Write an enzyme that holds these catalytic residues in place. Structure first.
Site, PDB file in Angstrom:
ATOM      1  N   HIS A   1     -21.599   4.681   4.078  1.00 23.53           N
ATOM      2  CA  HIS A   1     -21.609   3.279   3.571  1.00 23.53           C
ATOM      3  C   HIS A   1     -21.026   2.303   4.599  1.00 23.53           C
ATOM      4  O   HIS A   1     -21.203   1.087   4.419  1.00 23.53           O
ATOM      5  CB  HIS A   1     -20.915   3.146   2.217  1.00 23.53           C
ATOM      6  CG  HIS A   1     -19.434   3.093   2.358  1.00 23.53           C
ATOM      7  ND1 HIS A   1     -18.695   4.211   2.667  1.00 23.53           N
ATOM      8  CD2 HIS A   1     -18.581   2.062   2.273  1.00 23.53           C
ATOM      9  CE1 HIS A   1     -17.415   3.848   2.792  1.00 23.53           C
ATOM     10  NE2 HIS A   1     -17.320   2.525   2.577  1.00 23.53           N
ATOM     11  N   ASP A   2     -20.298   2.757   5.607  1.00 23.04           N
ATOM     12  CA  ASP A   2     -19.738   1.803   6.629  1.00 23.04           C
ATOM     13  C   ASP A   2     -20.185   2.223   8.046  1.00 23.04           C
ATOM     14  O   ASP A   2     -19.495   1.929   9.016  1.00 23.04           O
ATOM     15  CB  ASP A   2     -18.215   1.779   6.485  1.00 23.04           C
ATOM     16  CG  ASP A   2     -17.634   0.737   5.528  1.00 23.04           C
ATOM     17  OD1 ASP A   2     -18.225  -0.367   5.347  1.00 23.04           O
ATOM     18  OD2 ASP A   2     -16.539   0.991   5.045  1.00 23.04           O
TER      19      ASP A   2
ATOM     20  N   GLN B   1      -1.103  -8.581  -1.515  1.00 20.48           N
ATOM     21  CA  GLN B   1      -1.468  -7.313  -2.197  1.00 20.48           C
ATOM     22  C   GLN B   1      -1.448  -7.529  -3.719  1.00 20.48           C
ATOM     23  O   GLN B   1      -2.449  -7.136  -4.380  1.00 20.48           O
ATOM     24  CB  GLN B   1      -0.576  -6.155  -1.716  1.00 20.48           C
ATOM     25  CG  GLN B   1      -0.882  -5.664  -0.299  1.00 20.48           C
ATOM     26  CD  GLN B   1      -2.242  -5.039  -0.257  1.00 20.48           C
ATOM     27  OE1 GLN B   1      -2.563  -4.138  -1.037  1.00 20.48           O
ATOM     28  NE2 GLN B   1      -3.091  -5.613   0.589  1.00 20.48           N
TER      29      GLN B   1
ATOM     30  N   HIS C   1     -12.141   6.951   6.584  1.00 19.08           N
ATOM     31  CA  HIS C   1     -12.469   6.104   5.401  1.00 19.08           C
ATOM     32  C   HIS C   1     -13.741   6.615   4.736  1.00 19.08           C
ATOM     33  O   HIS C   1     -13.773   6.776   3.491  1.00 19.08           O
ATOM     34  CB  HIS C   1     -12.572   4.659   5.799  1.00 19.08           C
ATOM     35  CG  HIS C   1     -13.138   3.784   4.741  1.00 19.08           C
ATOM     36  ND1 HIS C   1     -12.396   3.424   3.666  1.00 19.08           N
ATOM     37  CD2 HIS C   1     -14.278   3.064   4.693  1.00 19.08           C
ATOM     38  CE1 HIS C   1     -13.073   2.554   2.928  1.00 19.08           C
ATOM     39  NE2 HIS C   1     -14.263   2.349   3.519  1.00 19.08           N
TER      40      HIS C   1
ATOM     41  N   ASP D   1     -14.681   2.714  -2.766  1.00 17.45           N
ATOM     42  CA  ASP D   1     -14.407   1.979  -1.520  1.00 17.45           C
ATOM     43  C   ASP D   1     -12.973   1.482  -1.528  1.00 17.45           C
ATOM     44  O   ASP D   1     -12.373   1.436  -0.454  1.00 17.45           O
ATOM     45  CB  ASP D   1     -15.372   0.825  -1.404  1.00 17.45           C
ATOM     46  CG  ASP D   1     -15.564   0.327  -0.004  1.00 17.45           C
ATOM     47  OD1 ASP D   1     -15.024   0.934   0.923  1.00 17.45           O
ATOM     48  OD2 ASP D   1     -16.287  -0.620   0.130  1.00 17.45           O
TER      49      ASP D   1
ATOM     50  N   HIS E   1     -12.050   0.989   9.138  1.00 15.14           N
ATOM     51  CA  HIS E   1     -13.469   1.291   8.810  1.00 15.14           C
ATOM     52  C   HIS E   1     -14.024   2.417   9.712  1.00 15.14           C
ATOM     53  O   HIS E   1     -15.003   2.237  10.408  1.00 15.14           O
ATOM     54  CB  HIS E   1     -14.250  -0.009   8.834  1.00 15.14           C
ATOM     55  CG  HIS E   1     -13.993  -0.881   7.649  1.00 15.14           C
ATOM     56  ND1 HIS E   1     -13.253  -2.050   7.740  1.00 15.14           N
ATOM     57  CD2 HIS E   1     -14.354  -0.750   6.350  1.00 15.14           C
ATOM     58  CE1 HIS E   1     -13.209  -2.612   6.559  1.00 15.14           C
ATOM     59  NE2 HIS E   1     -13.854  -1.823   5.670  1.00 15.14           N
TER      60      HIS E   1
HETATM   61  C1  LIG Z   1      -5.746  -2.528  -0.175  1.00 14.04           C
HETATM   62  C2  LIG Z   1      -7.036  -3.201   0.123  1.00 14.04           C
HETATM   63  N1  LIG Z   1      -8.251  -2.510   0.001  1.00 14.04           N
HETATM   64  C3  LIG Z   1      -9.443  -3.107   0.302  1.00 14.04           C
HETATM   65  C4  LIG Z   1      -9.495  -4.451   0.803  1.00 14.04           C
HETATM   66  C5  LIG Z   1     -10.820  -5.132   1.128  1.00 14.04           C
HETATM   67  N2  LIG Z   1      -8.257  -5.156   0.845  1.00 14.04           N
HETATM   68  N3  LIG Z   1      -7.996  -6.389   1.247  1.00 14.04           N
HETATM   69  C6  LIG Z   1      -6.654  -6.610   1.285  1.00 14.04           C
HETATM   70  C7  LIG Z   1      -6.083  -7.888   1.659  1.00 14.04           C
HETATM   71  C8  LIG Z   1      -5.514  -8.461   0.371  1.00 14.04           C
HETATM   72  C9  LIG Z   1      -4.946  -9.824   0.744  1.00 14.04           C
HETATM   73  N4  LIG Z   1      -3.911  -9.998   1.630  1.00 14.04           N
HETATM   74  C10 LIG Z   1      -3.768 -11.356   1.660  1.00 14.04           C
HETATM   75  N5  LIG Z   1      -2.843 -12.029   2.423  1.00 14.04           N
HETATM   76  C11 LIG Z   1      -2.521 -13.435   2.357  1.00 14.04           C
HETATM   77  C12 LIG Z   1      -1.637 -13.639   3.561  1.00 14.04           C
HETATM   78  C13 LIG Z   1      -0.845 -12.370   3.448  1.00 14.04           C
HETATM   79  F1  LIG Z   1      -0.108 -12.363   2.394  1.00 14.04           F
HETATM   80  C14 LIG Z   1      -1.903 -11.364   3.249  1.00 14.04           C
HETATM   81  N6  LIG Z   1      -4.623 -12.001   0.861  1.00 14.04           N
HETATM   82  N7  LIG Z   1      -5.359 -11.042   0.244  1.00 14.04           N
HETATM   83  C15 LIG Z   1      -6.408 -11.300  -0.763  1.00 14.04           C
HETATM   84  N8  LIG Z   1      -6.037  -5.488   0.863  1.00 14.04           N
HETATM   85  C16 LIG Z   1      -7.055  -4.581   0.621  1.00 14.04           C
HETATM   86 MG   LIG Z   2     -18.111  -1.904   4.049  1.00 10.73          MG
HETATM   87 ZN   LIG Z   3     -15.847   0.992   3.031  1.00 11.14          ZN
END
Ligand SMILES: Cc1ncc(C)n2nc(CCc3nc(N4CC[C@@H](F)C4)nn3C)nc12
Ligand SMILES: [Mg+2]
Ligand SMILES: [Zn+2]
Length: 313
Positions: A106-107, A269, A72, A217, A68
């Site tokens: 925005h951040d 992912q 970004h 975003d 952040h």
């Molecule tokens: C690419 C991207 N851009 C924006 C944002 C906000 N995010 N957030 C994630 C996290 C995605 C995510 N990873 C997991 N775990 C579970 C345990 C392990 F496997 C990781 N759960 N989740 C939902 N990747 C992004």
């Molecule tokens: Mg934000």
């Molecule tokens: Zn952002």
């Protein structure tokens, strides 16, 4: 007045594409942003000296956190630029003015922690702003910087155009709270399918700009695979530090923030692409057909995470 920002030829051509990466040369990012304002808005939009001072104060108020950060901010503003240039005639002059600024801001002053961590730590910002904690902070930091001497890039607008632009920026910044995205996208999906969607209805435009904000975003998932995969490393570097901080408060973090679940990342992912990204870019493409390359690039990156799971990468 007769002064145009230009870019080297590879950048001048690739900056127009959705999948452009702004590169590792920090000192070029301000120039890249002004280039995008000049082309999406005009050399007339902002006084160059005021704009340059505003950009440099915005940069100074981003912190040196893994994800952040200032990179970004400029990345999310370039995705907005690409949306605006592919949908020329859909947007007002005030929207064009406000939304690139909203993206850059925005951040602002992000600390690398989620709204949920501020609420559990009982950070002062959590008592001042009960929901969308960081996002209300980012808008408050944007207003602060606009009020510094020599930093009012909007000083040529009327009292009422000024109030409108700050309102476009506020809603655009609030919409970057992913907790709000799910409901926004469901309302948009229904309005589009039943044909009630109306871009002359201000509260409809508001939702469409909200979705454009989520799309910009999240735009790391729409890049060339090596950009996608290396940004994922920054994203987790934050989440796992937050996980460490949750354990320090005697709280089991969610899996996403637990570095002991390092191995499940490919599968986290997948859930993220299916639950959040793909639905975001699908709805966006229905409403603004020329944004389809974002959906197409997201789908490509999903199948790259699928290959990582199958042991082919
Ligand atoms: C690419 C991207 N851009 C924006 C944002 C906000 N995010 N957030 C994630 C996290 C995605 C995510 N990873 C997991 N775990 C579970 C345990 C392990 F496997 C990781 N759960 N989740 C939902 N990747 C992004
Ligand atoms: Mg934000
Ligand atoms: Zn952002």
């Amino acid at each position: 007045g007769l002064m145009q920002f230009t870019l080297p030829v590879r950048l001048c051509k690739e900056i127009e594409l959705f999948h452009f990466d702004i590169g590792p040369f920090e000192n070029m990012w301000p120039g890249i942003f002004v280039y995008m304002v000049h082309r999406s808005c005009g050399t007339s939009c902002f006084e160059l000296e005021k704009l340059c001072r505003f950009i440099m104060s915005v940069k100074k108020n981003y912190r040196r956190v893994p994800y952040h950060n200032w990179k970004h901010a400029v990345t999310v503003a370039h995705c907005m630029y690409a949306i605006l240039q592919n949908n020329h005639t859909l947007f007002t002059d005030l929207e064009r003015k406000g939304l690139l600024i909203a993206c850059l801001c925005h951040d602002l002053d992000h600390r690398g922690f989620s709204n949920s961590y501020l609420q559990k730590f009982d950070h002062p910002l959590a008592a001042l702003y009960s929901t969308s904690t960081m996002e209300q902070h980012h808008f408050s930091q944007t207003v602060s910087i606009l009020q510094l001497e020599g930093h009012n890039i909007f000083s040529t607008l009327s009292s009422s155009e000024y109030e409108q632009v700050l309102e476009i920026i506020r809603k655009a910044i609030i919409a970057t709270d992913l907790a709000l995205y799910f409901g926004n996208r469901k309302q948009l999906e229904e309005m589009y399918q039943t044909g009630s969607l109306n871009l002359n209805n201000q509260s409809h435009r508001d939702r469409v700009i909200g979705l454009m904000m989520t799309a910009c975003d999240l735009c790391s998932v729409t890049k060339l695979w090596p950009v996608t995969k290396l940004t994922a490393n920054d994203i987790y570097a934050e989440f796992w530090a937050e996980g460490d901080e949750m354990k320090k408060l005697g709280i089991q973090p969610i899996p996403m923030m637990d570095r002991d679940k390092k191995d499940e990342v490919p599968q986290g992912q997948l859930g993220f692409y299916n639950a959040v990204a793909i639905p975001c870019y699908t709805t966006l493409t229905q409403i603004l057909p020329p944004t389809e390359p974002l959906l197409k690039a997201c789908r490509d990156n999903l199948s790259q995470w699928e290959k990582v799971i199958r042991g082919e990468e």
